[PDB]
Amino acid sequence: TPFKIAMVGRYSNEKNQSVLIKAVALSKYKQDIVLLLKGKGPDEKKIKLLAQKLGVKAEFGFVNSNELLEILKTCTLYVHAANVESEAIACLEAISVGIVPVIANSPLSATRQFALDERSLFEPNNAKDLSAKIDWWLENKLERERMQNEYAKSALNYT
């Protein structure tokens, strides 16, 4: 599978892994995407089953601060789907190493500040919008690579 897309964080209603699972189910490139949904929490079984039901490729399990770096090495995109108002440690670490994010434009969520432009934002819970945003990045390797470097620079500034 060529495109790995990560979301790291608690499996919870607040983090909304489900919108990302549905976005991949809706993607023009569904077959070419694997979601790396890393964490622990009350929704673990629900989202495992959702990915199976929808035919979405996903890899679960938990990662500590060290192991996340290894995973990010391999990622094509990072998605922070959270509505509330959530820790975004992994999102900041993703952009720091030069991975383009797509982040929920939650007006309560401070994480949306990391987006450099609208191509890296999606409307909260809007699975079709997230799907379109992901597909655009997958279609645009050259611009994705350019933006990776812009993200690494912006992340440094934030830290």
Side-chain angles (χ1 to χ4, degrees):
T1 312
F3 308 127
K4 297 189 182 197
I5 301 179
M7 178 173 167
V8 176
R10 188 168 178 255
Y11 303 151
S12 68
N13 177 76
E14 288 84 356
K15 293 286 198 177
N16 198 3
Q17 282 84 184
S18 293
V19 70
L20 177 53
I21 296 167
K22 296 184 183 188
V24 173
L26 297 161
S27 171
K28 296 187 290 187
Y29 312 117
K30 179 184 182 189
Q31 300 314 316
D32 294 316
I33 297 160
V34 173
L35 294 175
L36 310 178
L37 302 178
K38 306 291 176 173
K40 281 191 263 212
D43 287 355
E44 181 200 14
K45 300 303 174 63
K46 183 163 79 177
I47 62 174
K48 279 175 174 176
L49 195 64
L50 184 66
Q52 187 183 236
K53 176 181 71 183
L54 296 182
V56 172
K57 295 179 198 183
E59 188 193 83
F60 295 84
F62 179 83
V63 291
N64 74 21
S65 310
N66 309 125
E67 299 172 305
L68 190 28
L69 199 279
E70 283 306 304
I71 284 166
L72 293 171
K73 284 184 189 183
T74 76
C75 284
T76 296
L77 289 173
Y78 185 90
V79 172
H80 177 89
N83 298 316
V84 155
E85 275 90 3
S86 191
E87 62 77 22
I89 188 150
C91 189
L92 177 57
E93 73 182 281
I95 65 165
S96 291
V97 301
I99 299 163
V100 172
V102 191
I103 306 158
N105 194 27
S106 185
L108 291 95
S109 156
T111 315
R112 73 189 191 154
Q113 75 176 304
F114 292 143
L116 289 172
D117 59 65
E118 60 194 289
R119 301 165 305 171
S120 283
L121 290 168
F122 76 97
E123 286 303 296
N125 207 44
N126 186 339
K128 285 180 80 163
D129 186 42
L130 178 55
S131 196
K133 297 273 166 64
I134 287 166
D135 286 356
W136 190 90
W137 286 116
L138 298 182
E139 285 166 357
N140 288 91
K141 181 169 172 157
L142 185 76
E143 180 71 353
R144 191 177 64 240
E145 287 176 341
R146 186 186 78 78
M147 290 303 297
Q148 289 179 167
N149 298 157
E150 290 293 339
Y151 275 102
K153 182 189 307 161
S154 72
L156 172 71
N157 293 356
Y158 176 92
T159 304

